[PDB]
Amino acid sequence: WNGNFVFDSPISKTLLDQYATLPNEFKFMRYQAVTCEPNQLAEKNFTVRQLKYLTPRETELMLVVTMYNEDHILLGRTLKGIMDNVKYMVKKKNSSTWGPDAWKKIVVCIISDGRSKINERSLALLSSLGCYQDGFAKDEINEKKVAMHVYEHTTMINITNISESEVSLECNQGTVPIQLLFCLKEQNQKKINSHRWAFEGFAELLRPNIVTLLDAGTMPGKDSIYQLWREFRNPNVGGACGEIRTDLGKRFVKLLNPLVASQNFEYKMSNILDKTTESNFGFITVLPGAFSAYRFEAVRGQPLQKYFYGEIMENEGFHFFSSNMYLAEDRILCFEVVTKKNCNWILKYCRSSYASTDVPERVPEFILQRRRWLNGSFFASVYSFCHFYRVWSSGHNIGRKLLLTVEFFYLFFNTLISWFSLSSFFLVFRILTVSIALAYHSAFNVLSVIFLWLYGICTLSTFILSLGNKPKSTEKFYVLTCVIFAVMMIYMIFCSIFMSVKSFQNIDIVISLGSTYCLYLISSIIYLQPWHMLTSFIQYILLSPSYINVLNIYAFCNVHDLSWNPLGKINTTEDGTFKMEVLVSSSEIQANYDKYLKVLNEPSYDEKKTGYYANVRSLVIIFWVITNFIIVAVVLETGGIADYIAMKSISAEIPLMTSKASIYFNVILWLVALSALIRFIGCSIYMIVRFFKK
Amino acid sequence: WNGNFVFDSPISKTLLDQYATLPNEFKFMRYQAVTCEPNQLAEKNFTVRQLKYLTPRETELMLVVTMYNEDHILLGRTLKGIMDNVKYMVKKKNSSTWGPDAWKKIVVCIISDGRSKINERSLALLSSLGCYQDGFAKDEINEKKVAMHVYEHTTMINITNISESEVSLECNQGTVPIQLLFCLKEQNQKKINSHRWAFEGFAELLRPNIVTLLDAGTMPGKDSIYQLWREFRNPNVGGACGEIRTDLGKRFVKLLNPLVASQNFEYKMSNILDKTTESNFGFITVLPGAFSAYRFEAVRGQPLQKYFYGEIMENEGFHFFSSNMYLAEDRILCFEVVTKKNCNWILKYCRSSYASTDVPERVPEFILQRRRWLNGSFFASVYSFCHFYRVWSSGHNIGRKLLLTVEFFYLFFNTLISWFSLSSFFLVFRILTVSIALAYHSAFNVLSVIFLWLYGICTLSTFILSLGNKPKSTEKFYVLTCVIFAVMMIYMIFCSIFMSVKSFQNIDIVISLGSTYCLYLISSIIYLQPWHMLTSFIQYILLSPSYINVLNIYAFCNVHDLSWNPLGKINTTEDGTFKMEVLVSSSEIQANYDKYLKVLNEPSYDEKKTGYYANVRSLVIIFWVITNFIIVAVVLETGGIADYIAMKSISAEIPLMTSKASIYFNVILWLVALSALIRFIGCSIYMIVRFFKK
Numbered sequence A, B: 001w002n003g004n005f006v007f008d009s010p011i012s013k014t015l016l017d018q019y020a021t022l023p024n025e026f027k028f029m030r031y032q033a034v035t036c037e038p039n040q041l042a043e044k045n046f047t048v049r050q051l052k053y054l055t056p057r058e059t060e061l062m063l064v065v066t067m068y069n070e071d072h073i074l075l076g077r078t079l080k081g082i083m084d085n086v087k088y089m090v091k092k093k094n095s096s097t098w099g100p101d102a103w104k105k106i107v108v109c110i111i112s113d114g115r116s117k118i119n120e121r122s123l124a125l126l127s128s129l130g131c132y133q134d135g136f137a138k139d140e141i142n143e144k145k146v147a148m149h150v151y152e153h154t155t156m157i158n159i160t161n162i163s164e165s166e167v168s169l170e171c172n173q174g175t176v177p178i179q180l181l182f183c184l185k186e187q188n189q190k191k192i193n194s195h196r197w198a199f200e201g202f203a204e205l206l207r208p209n210i211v212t213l214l215d216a217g218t219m220p221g222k223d224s225i226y227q228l229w230r231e232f233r234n235p236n237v238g239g240a241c242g243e244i245r246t247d248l249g250k251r252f253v254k255l256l257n258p259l260v261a262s263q264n265f266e267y268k269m270s271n272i273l274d275k276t277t278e279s280n281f282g283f284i285t286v287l288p289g290a291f292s293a294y295r296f297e298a299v300r301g302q303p304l305q306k307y308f309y310g311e312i313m314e315n316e317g318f319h320f321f322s323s324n325m326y327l328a329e330d331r332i333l334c335f336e337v338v339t340k341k342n343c344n345w346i347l348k349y350c351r352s353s354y355a356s357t358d359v360p361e362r363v364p365e366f367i368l369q370r371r372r373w374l375n376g377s378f379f380a381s382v383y384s385f386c387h388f389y390r391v392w393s394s395g396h397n398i399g400r401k402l403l404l405t406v407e408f409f410y411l412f413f414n415t416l417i418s419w420f421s422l423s424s425f426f427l428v429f430r431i432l433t434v435s436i437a438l439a440y441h442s443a444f445n446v447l448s449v450i451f452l453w454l455y456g457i458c459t460l461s462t463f464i465l466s467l468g469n470k471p472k473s474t475e476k477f478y479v480l481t482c483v484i485f486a487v488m489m490i491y492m493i494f495c496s497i498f499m500s501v502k503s504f505q506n507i508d509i510v511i512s513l514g515s516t517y518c519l520y521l522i523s524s525i526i527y528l529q530p531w532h533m534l535t536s537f538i539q540y541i542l543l544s545p546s547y548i549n550v551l552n553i554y555a556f557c558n559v560h561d562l563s564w565n566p567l568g569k570i571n572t573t574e575d576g577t578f579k580m581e582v583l584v585s586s587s588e589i590q591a592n593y594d595k596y597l598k599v600l601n602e603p604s605y606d607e608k609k610t611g612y613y614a615n616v617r618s619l620v621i622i623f624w625v626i627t628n629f630i631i632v633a634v635v636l637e638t639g640g641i642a643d644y645i646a647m648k649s650i651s652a653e654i655p656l657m658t659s660k661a662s663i664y665f666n667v668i669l670w671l672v673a674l675s676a677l678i679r680f681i682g683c684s685i686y687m688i689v690r691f692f693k694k
């Protein structure tokens, strides 16, 4: 058909039996062998059923779900969320867009990447829905490798219950049809290629209004997708995101794990403070698991082009934003949408839309997950700060350009703070432990020495294992390191409290620690989600030194993933002379000798790119360590500086502590207080504006 | 023939033309397809021509030449050296073993690691000799992969001149026949497998008296092989080696390179001191490039068995020595032969036999070469010290057992010194630079701070690049680091000389530095090779800090090399319906659905061994760094110890320097003087004994 392989094989008699409990699209399942590039779907005469009926279907919302090639449970969770949202949107009464036939304006796209990696349970479930069936998959046509397989069905069944082991599929008068579209790549290309298929491929044929990106295992709420869609009423909005919640399992059983409570508090703090503060200015960065939506006309053009391919202008050699730009290629979309030329798109954060995802529960996978977040956030901030002049070439008004400039400066200020945390934590810890020892003398001298040595044995080992080993290989040591750092944090808290109490008895750390805690709590109260402030808060404080001295070290030590004529067969069962008298010459005997006597008379692009990536990774690490030690040696007078000053004075001996320690200790808490104040003000403005608009 | 593939195809008419300038073996070149394991050559009915004549040939000396890339010129020099020695031995008149037919008692075996890797120029050279010709190589026989190809010829031509670009081959009345035997493995197995073929394979058929190991590119002297053979007159000798000389090129042009003069001095010091002294005690090890010889009956049995396969007693898990035995596998033979049960074999060092090899001239390949020497020497010393009790289970007399015990203790003492060199160098450097600054105040304060920072920026970078990067990628930085370390060594020498001169003017470092230099020079004079003591000595002193702070770091950071349903090709040009009406059942439509609904109703040994190796590498590194810093912090009172002592005294402030620095500084030079004295006495005893015996 039209030069492409197609097939319409009716779904199982069983499925068809319940579907009737009939128009044409419910009854056949269509297959399509896509053998072109994603950016060629329209010109290759490839189409989708939405475009073939008597009246073509104008789609309003395209839900792209990236199959995790994982257990059906996660995918079933995502699909159940989507079907619940669609049912809500078809039961809506007073609405111009959604109605009893909105099931026709929504398309679900499941871009599975591993044709072999895909879990059998997923295909088994997808088959139950009727959007897949085995048997007709041509791995080669016209002597050309088919790039992916497209199966299209409109199933009338919905998942209504998902226990710990089963998904309940039923077909009643209350179920709604859903337009599935199962894409299935055949070879392991990364997530950016899945997005390339979603955006440059099927979105070019369907022409949606909004394009929503989901993952496998992310459950949207009963009402989340509709609330995210409502954000695009304002014609200026070019993107949006929602809240991310850690799901705690049956009656919050997972809170007993101390690595899940930490992430619960971290997620809810992030959503309450950072997302609202950024959304006030107008530029936000979708969280890794946060469900996102992009108005199609907004991302179309330059944003997509530099998200997929990167900076085109590049010679044969490599460049920081021409060979390393991909590091922030994702957040590039947000950076490119906001700063589009002659266009005033803004990014908005929706709090009425949430999605509950599952968080890692062991330290190895936690470290491996955060390795991609930290590198992405660091490179994205560097790039956005370096290219802030683009804000003044866009189409915004003067006030919105000024606001965006201020936000970019503040974001780079936060990045600069996070870069020096390695030295800041050690400086605070050492100054505090030596000050209390020097003031009270009781047993804190030996504790100071012991804790200095414990930190050094855990920092050195973390560097070495992150540079050479893998987290899965050594999990017990990482658990031990986290426990040791938690004990050090307990001791630091004890020193601060104890000296503050004694100073109160005798008559700033107490002043700030209370201010930032109260700002946190007041923001939580205003956001109307205050239970995290006590339920899962302590574990965040104890596993906070391990977020500054383990996740950062591994993230920086693993910036890029660097992966560095036969003939002659004789076998005669009867020992027969197959060659016999043949292949027997006297002139050839001289030919080989003459030829042999006559003889006696940079590697590929991959290794070059790998070398460049390794050099970048080892230059970043070295600069990080050197600058942090520069700060430490300037403050504590380590590195032989105190020796040098003593020698100049002789031209004496080293004192125990100086006023530089006090000055630095005050500066750090002032910075912390300023950051907390800024984020509190941002959250307050967000809630006030939202309330007035509502 | 006998169930194995053979072929006797006369050599080129050209070759045969000069050979006559005729008995049977000169005129045919025999091929053999070896399809068995090395330890099965005799039982498989595989033989070599030496065993087929009317009277079998009892071989007296078997020479093994290992070739991998099989570069030409290098192989040409190796063959020319062997040819010269054989012709000299045949010329020898007053000898029972050697005479006009001495060549028949010597067999030359050339084993190539990979036919794909062998250099075409070499194979061509081999063809010129007539021991190889292309065309009849069966990569498969009897449905079994042939393990290696054996070509056997007895050529009458010799190489008589090797210019920089040509090898001069002539056939006169003065040339001697040589019994070549070209082994050619087909896939890249390592050098230990080449030795397994040499020892468990063809040596089992030939039954030689002495087995000599050479490496392509190494040139034995005009008389070296005979002088090495003469060492086995003493029935107690079980092995032997000779001197290694760096060849300096045409009129010593290569001495202008400062990385070649350093290795020249290092090699000649090693041969003069360490070999002679070790030879005195016995159990004299062999240098990596040093040509070696083993009496066949000596190595046969337990030594070979534990050299090739390692410790047999082992469960499914890993053990340290068993798994890491390969690190000391080559230096297992020497340890095994000496300590053989009920046998009194000794190892002797022959100075009358030498061989000139080529040394690396760039820093990357120099580091990569020394990475295998340092690891081998470290593991061999550890194993030999751990298993010294085996000396008292052998057959030696009481005095020789005592001597071997003493030698093992002294060798581990040297290894223990070499383990702490990282801290020793820094301690000496820092104490010296702070002492001169503290005494004279002029400009040495800033120099002390500058040099402390330069060392730390070059040590940190060396660790990071050795752990993450590769030497070839960053050569300029390694050159810069070596230059910086040479400048630091110049400054240390200046400080020592300057303070010693001022102290002489006012009235131990001078005392020792002169004693060790004089012992070096007197040993060189007694060994009668004194030109190195001035020609290539200074460059060794300047590139000595880079041998302690670059080669060691890279060697320890790279202990082990850790390398972590197609169907439906439907392409009908005429749009032919291959399935057509067929493949249109309806019962199958239900079968897949039912099966799919029913579904919805540790890695391999390699990764485990790799994980173990990485863990061993990262535990060794950590222990090395920790112990060296323990020494440094105890001496200099770093690591917060001085702070702790000051706090106890308060229960004051840190002084600049203590008496621990003086005590340590004296202890180090005492150790150096003791080592120099021991090696001088050993060399003197060696020369005196050799002179009296001669």
Ligand SMILES: CC(=O)N[C@H]1[C@@H](OP(=O)(O)OP(=O)(O)OC[C@H]2O[C@@H](n3ccc(=O)[nH]c3=O)[C@H](O)[C@@H]2O)O[C@H](CO)[C@@H](O)[C@@H]1O
Residues within 6 Å of the ligand: A066, A067, A068, A069, A113, A189, A190, A191, A215, A216, A288, A359, A360, A365, A366, A368, A369, A372
């Ligand atoms: C290197 C690594 O170990 N990554 C970890 C991390 O990354 P992290 O969670 O960032 O990444 P994910 O693998 O979860 O990727 C998110 C989306 O990408 C799809 N998709 C598609 C193609 C592809 O190559 N990769 C891919 O991830 C995923 O199923 C999902 O749809 O998260 C999890 C920890 O809880 C673990 O699964 C992993 O240990």
Ligand SMILES: CC(=O)N[C@H]1[C@@H](OP(=O)(O)OP(=O)(O)OC[C@H]2O[C@@H](n3ccc(=O)[nH]c3=O)[C@H](O)[C@@H]2O)O[C@H](CO)[C@@H](O)[C@@H]1O
Residues within 6 Å of the ligand: B066, B067, B068, B069, B070, B113, B189, B190, B191, B215, B216, B288, B359, B360, B365, B366, B368, B369, B372
């Ligand atoms: C990892 C590495 O880079 N090794 C370096 C080093 O090791 P090094 O000199 O120790 O090792 P060599 O490669 O020279 O080995 C010696 C003998 O082994 C043969 N043989 C056989 C099989 C095999 O796998 N390997 C093998 O070496 C060799 O040709 C020779 O006959 O020496 C040289 C430096 O001047 C360089 O060639 C190399 O850069």
Ligand SMILES: [Mg+2]
Residues within 6 Å of the ligand: A068, A215, A216, A217
């Ligand atoms: Mg997931």
Ligand SMILES: [Mg+2]
Residues within 6 Å of the ligand: B215, B216, B217
């Ligand atoms: Mg070589």
